[PDB]
Design a protein around this ligand. Structure first.
Ligand SMILES: Cc1cc2nc3c(=O)[nH]c(=O)nc-3n(C[C@H](O)[C@H](O)[C@H](O)COP(=O)(O)O)c2cc1C
Ligand code: SF4
Lengths: 428, 56
């Protein structure tokens, strides 16, 4: 099928553009908090089977089947309680989606946290967001005030005897904290530094207590899945890439935007249908960044005719991540762009891994030289070898995030660099 | 070389060979000293890639 071409009756995250109210009242109107009690009765196993049938995958980073990620924790308890955590953080360049989800749809997020905690026999949900989003944390705390005062949360969840709690947290302005482990550590107060897998948060972690992590979009859609059927949902996506998705189109475009869409949709259709069209004319387009900084670019030859999903991007040698589609044209120093993208990491790498701490800066300096061509070619292959050295020899995916962009830039746009270098030599 | 023609002829008749052509002493038949500052090469191991020690 020609995927996409969606219906605003199936599009989930309504009120996206805040044209309606975001309080409990408008939420109940939209269709929030419907027979949650019957769901809590049905219990965990049914919910997990529903998600597995749906075949959903994850949004944040690589696609890890949520059904299995949560069955990891589905288990009795040994005094050690069990917690859930929500990664409201959003710093990955090109992502302006969880912020909207929160300031315009917080009740649904709370509902999803509740359903997930019930699935995992939890006790509470810690929603960790950044610090700059004071307004969003405020709106969300207000919605939680309303929820508590009503009775949809707390001792008596909605009529059952399930005791659940919600707590909110702000970071202090870091990005790495959006990692499954240093998030937990920042919560606990220890520096925002990750841990080693194994062990896994699903058995050992926060406060030495088992816990699970989840992205806001996943937790917010899981309830709609549970109350709509799952199979219907999966019908809106390919075998593995099932589901709708949020996209954030930015860069060289007439009208940047945030959008809801279907998975496995053509990127060309996406850009030219919404956004009012690409700037300056399609032909002026040079390359893309379909997954933010955590993915490498791709030029015209594949920006056209491609699909959009974890698979068929992997095949294209790349990933998807957050669906942060940046677009450029023939008017920018790709090298300066990517050098700033890497200085981002050089500023926001925690530092405890030697290759990260001492190779990201190497890369930044070598790319700042590439900017002006004050170098010589074989440094290209040197940098490629450095990237292949870094990739797997770290802890958090940020190593791959710092390597991949360079790998793509150098697998695609070498002649630009070579010509920069010869031209600079000419200029002496 | 500063010596005389007749003595050249005499020593040459004595020996049998010629000597003004294959003297042992050194009259500016050498390479000047104070040679210029040179620049040197390196090996095939001063590359930047495909030089992993595990190979060699
Ligand atoms: C370095 C790094 C930064 C991340 N930053 C964010 C972020 O800012 N916002 C977000 O929603 N996810 C972010 N993620 C995605 C996380 O991996 C995700 O919250 C979690 O690890 C996996 O959850 P999921 O399987 O439900 O997607 C980040 C991941 C990494 C590795
Ligand atoms: S790879 Fe870098 S950012 Fe990630 S834990 Fe190691 S030092 Fe920190």
């Amino acid at each position: 099928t020609s995927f996409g071409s969606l219906k605003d009756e199936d599009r989930i995250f309504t009120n996206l553009y805040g044209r309606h109210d975001w309080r409990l009242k408008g939420a109940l109107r939209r269709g929030d908090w419907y027979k949650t009690k019957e769901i809590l009765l049905k219990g965990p196993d049914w919910i997990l089977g529903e998600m597995k049938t749906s075949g959903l995958r994850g949004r944040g980073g690589a696609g890890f089947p949520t059904g299995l990620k949560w069955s990891f924790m589905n288990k009795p308890s040994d005094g050690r309680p069990k917690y859930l955590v929500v990664n409201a953080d959003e710093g990955e360049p090109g992502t302006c989606k969880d912020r909207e989800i929160m300031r315009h749809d917080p009740h649904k997020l709370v509902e999803g946290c509740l359903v997930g905690g019930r699935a995992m026999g939890a006790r509470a949900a810690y929603i960790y967001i950044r610090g700059e989003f004071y307004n969003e944390a405020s709106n969300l705390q207000v919605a939680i005030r309303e929820a508590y005062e009503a009775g949809l949360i707390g001792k008596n969840a909605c009529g059952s005897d399930y005791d659940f709690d919600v707590f909110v947290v702000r970071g202090a302005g870091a990005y790495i904290c959006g990692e499954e482990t240093a998030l937990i550590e920042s919560i606990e107060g220890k520096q925002g530094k990750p841990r080693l897998k194994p062990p896994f948060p699903a058995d050992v972690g926060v406060f030495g207590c088992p816990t699970t992590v989840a992205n806001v979009e996943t937790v917010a859609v899981s309830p709609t899945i549970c109350r709509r059927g799952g199979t219907w949902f999966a019908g809106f996506g390919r075998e593995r890439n099932s589901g709708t998705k949020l996209f954030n189109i930015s860069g060289h475009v007439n009208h940047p935007c945030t959008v809801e869409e279907e998975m496995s949709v053509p990127l060309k259709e996406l850009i030219e249908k919404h956004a009012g069209g690409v700037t300056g004319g399609w032909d002026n387009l040079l390359a893309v960044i379909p997954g933010g900084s955590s993915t490498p670019l791709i030029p015209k030859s594949v920006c056209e005719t491609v699909l959009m999903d974890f698979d068929a991007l992997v095949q294209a040698q790349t990933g998807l991540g957050t669906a942060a589609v940046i677009v450029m044209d023939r008017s920018t120093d790709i090298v300066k762009a990517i050098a700033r993208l890497i200085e981002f990491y050089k500023h926001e790498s925690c530092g405890q891994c030697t290759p990260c701490r001492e190779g990201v800066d190497w890369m930044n300096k070598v790319m700042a030289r590439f900017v002006k061509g004050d170098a010589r070619p074989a440094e290209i292959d040197s940098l490629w070898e450095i990237s292949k050295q870094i990739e797997g020899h770290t802890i958090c995916a940020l190593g791959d995030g710092a390597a991949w962009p360079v790998q793509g830039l150098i697998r695609h746009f070498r002649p630009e660099l070579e010509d920069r270098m010869q031209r600079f030599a000419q200029q002496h | 070389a500063s010596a005389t023609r007749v003595i050249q002829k005499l020593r040459n008749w004595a020996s049998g060979q010629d000597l003004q052509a294959k003297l042992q002493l050194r009259y500016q038949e050498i390479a000047k000293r104070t040679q210029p500052p040179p620049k040197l090469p390196v090996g095939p191991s001063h590359k930047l890639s495909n030089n992993y020690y595990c190979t060699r």
